[PDB]
């Protein structure tokens, strides 16, 4: 009815016929072509693995399970008075495939407000971390620990069947995004609030409004913004470093605890998950280079002193996307709305004017639009969060939804280990020297 | 001379001249197929990635830069009056591609207890960890904490050229390497020895040694299992799922500390690095269910009593080995000659007539042959590590070496993110039409 795991029960089979009979069909069809450049080049173009909960075109962005941005905006539902959907409505998109109704949701938020206790030993070894442990080796660290309490670990542990997997995974990551947004406050709270204590979860809010509570705000709008950050930010095919990670160690059958923890390393790479930091020390570094209000002469030169002497724009390109990011656009929509006059945002906005002419004039790129990153920072920093090092933990939070979205199929559709194939260079040489 | 870091030094050129040479040959040259089967079976087959310190040809197992098992034993150096080729010995090699002297590994076993060192919060958290918690998780948890002491991460922060980055990486993996011990005792000893000291480390023994001496063990015969058990385990191609995390984890430019944590995550897995606990485990009440004392024929039907039953035979196949591995062999050499008559050793041998007879007939094992895990548990048993839970903590030490040998030449190359293309279902059934 409202139960998301009978609901998901009567959908595996289905899928499992359709999934069997595709490869008992056209499991043989060459796809993709494997070169030198391909296997140095870190799989770039590679058709590598199957990921279902969303998918990305490299025109258009992202699709969550078919829906646009735009379309989810309109469809799933929404806080009482709010117009932005809740990250409930879309784990439930990526878990069932189908666009939940209002009491789904709510059913929802109230299941992960009751799985929100915390083990003691991981209150204790948070209160224990020092100061200058980074807030993502804290998250990583704290969730690794909670594997203790980790139904699939124990239940392996007695030899539990392949056909019951998926079951435990489901138990442990509704555990897991459930205590998510008390682990991701009680680092925020330790780090930048003088160890004061998160409170209690209340059973009649949404996730996204206990996190903010349990952070020490209490914004509308902020919490709006943080609701459609959850969202947009929650999953973005398999091919990404923290997807494809979690896909990696949970084809090992980790749990969702270990498999996620290994997935937020992924996140706190410069090249992954800590773009959304480097834009702003970019952008303030930029307003003491110049003042805070830079027209477009000087801003022209900047960007081309930052393009000549050998560095990039941050925010700016992507791996596969060769457009604007629809999850940009849907952030700057945000602001237009919100926070027009802000100094940052029309520093941003501005950019957004500029550095798509002069990254396609100058060549040696690909994608010269901006991407989810390079327009987080700002609205964080208009609602006084303004801890740049914290909003990783931000992102990994809300990839949380997909990729445990994922990994519950993953273990439903039996994927097995990953495991290809490496060569050295000598062994590459030879190869070609058939 | 015998500064490791300067060698080094002087080899990356040589390597990128090598390496862009190759490229600017055949960089567009086709190496493999990529098709629907790959996708959903976890890019077996496929020719995913480079990797240089080590390579598994199906045929003769793995080969450390192009040296065999046999080889490095006969090759690397050993202890002052001992058999066993030094680890150090090993990540030498790995790291420069030649065989270290006498000198140069005593220098790596000095520069490794120099930095030996544990920040105070990674042991004040190891000790306050539970016992419920996992030895791996307290090992990953440990890592991820540990990247506090991360040169690299603060260089990168601010601003280091990228041609510098396996500098920084070289020294993150010294202090990871020199410190992995420091942990695997610390939590051996909270969880097995009431939560005893380690004791001290002294700068004039090896690395297995002190290992072995904070483990609280002095029979020689046991440093000299973990000198061959670390040496062995310490690298096996890039695909597999520990190297490949660290891998994949590395390439976002995460440090050497998250890269191992994460590979630590993979190698928790039960499919990844638990095969010796359940060799174990299926040795034992094989033990009991039938005699001590079995006969070849009543041996043999106990297996295809398992074969039919629906449950594999633990420590025989693997993904891409299609051989007797040569880390059994080497394991079975030890065993014959510091323990031929153990009973747990002479079923072991007794099994490795019998299984690969059966297997090949029912037909489904495509490697009918044992891997590693088949007799590693019976040699740590038999010097009183008995604690199966650890096994995996010995196995992660050693896969150390391989993962940052390697992610220090990722990074001296430049090799660049891992970022593949992932695809739906239905989105694959689409692109076989068109
Ligand atoms: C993943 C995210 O959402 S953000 C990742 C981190 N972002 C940043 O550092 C800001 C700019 N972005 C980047 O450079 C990104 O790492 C990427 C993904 C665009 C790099 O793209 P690649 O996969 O290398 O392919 P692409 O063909 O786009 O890049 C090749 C060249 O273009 C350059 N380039 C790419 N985008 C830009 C840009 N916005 N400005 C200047 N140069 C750029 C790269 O630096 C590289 O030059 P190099 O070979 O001398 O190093
Ligand atoms: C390691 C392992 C998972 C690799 O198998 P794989 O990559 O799936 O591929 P295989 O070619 O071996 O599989 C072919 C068939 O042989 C079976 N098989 C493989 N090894 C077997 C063994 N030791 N005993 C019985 N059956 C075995 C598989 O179950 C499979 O049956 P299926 O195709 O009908 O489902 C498998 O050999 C195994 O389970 N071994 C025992 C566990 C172990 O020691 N693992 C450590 C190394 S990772
Ligand atoms: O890095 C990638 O591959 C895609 C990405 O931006 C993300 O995951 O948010």
């Not at 442990?133 to 690794?144: E, G, I």
Request: charged share 20%; glycine share 8%; aromatic share 10%.
């Amino acid at each position: 009815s409202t139960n998301l795991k009978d609901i998901l029960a009567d959908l595996i089979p289905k899928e499992q016929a359709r999934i069997k009979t595709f490869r008992q069909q056209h499991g043989k069809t060459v796809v993709g072509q494997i070169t030198v450049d391909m296997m140095y080049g870190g799989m770039r173009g590679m058709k590598g693995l199957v990921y279902e909960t969303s998918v990305l075109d490299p025109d258009e962005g992202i699709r969550f399970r078919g829906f646009s941005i735009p379309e989810c905006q309109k469809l799933l539902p929404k806080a009482k008075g709010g117009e932005e959907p809740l990250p409930e409505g879309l784990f439930w998109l990526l878990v069932t495939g189908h666009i939940p109704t209002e009491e789904q949701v709510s059913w929802l938020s109230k299941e992960w407000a009751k799985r929100a206790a915390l083990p003691s030993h991981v209150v204790t070894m948070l209160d224990n971390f020092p100061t200058n442990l980074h807030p993502m080796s804290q998250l990583s660290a704290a969730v690794t620990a909670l594997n203790s309490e980790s139904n699939f670990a124990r239940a392996y542990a007695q030899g539990i069947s392949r056909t019951k997997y998926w079951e435990l995974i489901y138990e442990d990551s509704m555990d897991l995004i459930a205590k998510l947004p008390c682990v991701a406050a009680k680092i925020y709270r330790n780090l930048y609030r003088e160890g004061s204590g998160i409170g209690a979860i209340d059973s009649n809010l949404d996730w996204s409004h206990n996190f903010t509570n349990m952070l020490g705000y209490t914004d509308h709008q902020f919490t709006e913004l943080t609701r459609l950050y959850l969202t947009i930010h929650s999953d973005h095919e398999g091919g990404n470093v923290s997807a494809h990670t979690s896909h990696l160690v949970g084809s090992a059958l980790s749990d969702p605890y270990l498999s996620f923890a290994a997935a937020m390393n992924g996140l706190a790479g410069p090249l992954h998950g800590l773009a959304n930091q480097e834009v702003l020390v970019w952008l303030t570094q930029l307003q003491k280079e110049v003042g805070k209000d830079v027209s477009d002469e000087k801003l022209r030169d900047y960007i081309w002193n930052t393009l000549n002497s050998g560095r990039v724009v941050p925010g700016y390109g992507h791996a596969v996307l060769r457009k604007t990011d629809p999850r940009y656009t849907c952030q700057r929509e945000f602001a237009l709305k919100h926070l027009p006059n802000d100094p940052m945002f029309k520093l941003v906005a501005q950019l957004y004017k500029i550095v798509p002419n002069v990254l396609l004039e100058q060549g040696k790129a690909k994608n010269p639009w901006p991407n989810v990153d390079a327009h987080s920072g700002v609205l964080l920093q208009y609602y006084g969060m303004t801890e740049m090092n914290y909003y990783t933990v931000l992102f990994g939070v809300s990839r949380a939804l997909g990729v445990l979205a994922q990994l519950i199929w993953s273990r439903a559709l039996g994927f097995p280990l990953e495991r290809p194939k490496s060569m050295s260079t000598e062994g590459l040489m030879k190869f070609v020297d058939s």
